[PDB]
Design brief:
Blueprint: no helix or strand
The structure holds zinc ion.
PDB class: metal binding protein
Keywords: zinc-binding domain, metal binding protein
Assembly: monomeric
Amino acid sequence: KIVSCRICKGDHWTTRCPYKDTLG
Ligand SMILES: [Zn+2]
């Protein structure tokens, strides 16, 4: 449908986000 990140809301899911440092 529509791809939207959950960390920066760019152009890529939350998995392929260039800032998935939210792993901890
Ligand atoms: Zn992102």
